[PDB]
């Protein structure tokens, strides 16, 4: 994990999008590409669309998933199984 010296990381072009809905009118569909962003407590209860290289994965956010990034919730390898 990252170094605690620097603040935890959020793209700021997204945290801007998280808070601006908190005041105007929650909520619509935030199409994101920043898989790198740690989930901020201000996101909870939102639906954000993590891209996987091809498509926008709907990700509804809850209070047990915070430290984890938006990337953990939209895999890229599509698998199914082997030998079926």
């Amino acid at each position: 994990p990252r170094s605690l010296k620097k603040g935890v990381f959020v793209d700021d072009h997204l945290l801007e999008k998280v808070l601006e809905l908190n005041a105007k009118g929650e909520k619509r569909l935030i199409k994101t590409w920043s898989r790198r962003s740690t989930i901020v407590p201000e996101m909870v209860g939102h639906t954000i669309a993590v891209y996987n290289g091809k498509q926008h994965v709907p990700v509804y956010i809850t209070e047990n998933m915070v430290g984890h990034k938006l990337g953990e919730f939209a895999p890229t390898r599509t698998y199914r199984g082997h030998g079926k």
Binding site: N64, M65, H68, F73
Partner: protein
């Protein structure tokens, strides 16, 4: 089942006998013999119930072990599974979590080899 939930081997030294318990590596066996004041070189068979209760009381009250440990462990894995994140998706299936390569190897997370015709 003396200390903690599991009775420890006599004849062997206590800085390893105490490691014969889930949750207690050599270093927790390092620190639990200065803090309760007992010689590491003495055997479980060469103690006194004074030396027994001090240790048992200390060891059980400090960190969490045994079932509760495993419980929280599974709990942490169950959460990682629940959401569910990739980290926890690799527990569902049962492949490596810490991003290994799978093409070859990984036989520890995958078990005995299912040779295919």
């Amino acid at each position: 089942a003396r200390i903690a939930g599991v009775e420890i081997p006599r004849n062997k030294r206590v800085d390893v006998a105490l490691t014969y318990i889930y949750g207690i590596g050599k270093a927790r066996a390092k620190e639990a013999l200065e803090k309760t004041g007992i010689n590491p070189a003495t055997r479980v068979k060469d103690l006194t119930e004074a030396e027994v209760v001090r240790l048992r009381e200390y060891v059980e009250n400090t960190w969490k072990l045994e079932g509760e440990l495993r419980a929280e462990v599974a709990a942490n894995i169950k959460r990682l599974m629940d959401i569910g994140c990739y980290r926890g998706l690799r527990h569902r299936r049962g492949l490596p979590v810490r991003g290994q390569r799978t093409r070859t190897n990984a036989r520890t997370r995958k078990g005995p080899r299912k040779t295919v015709a």
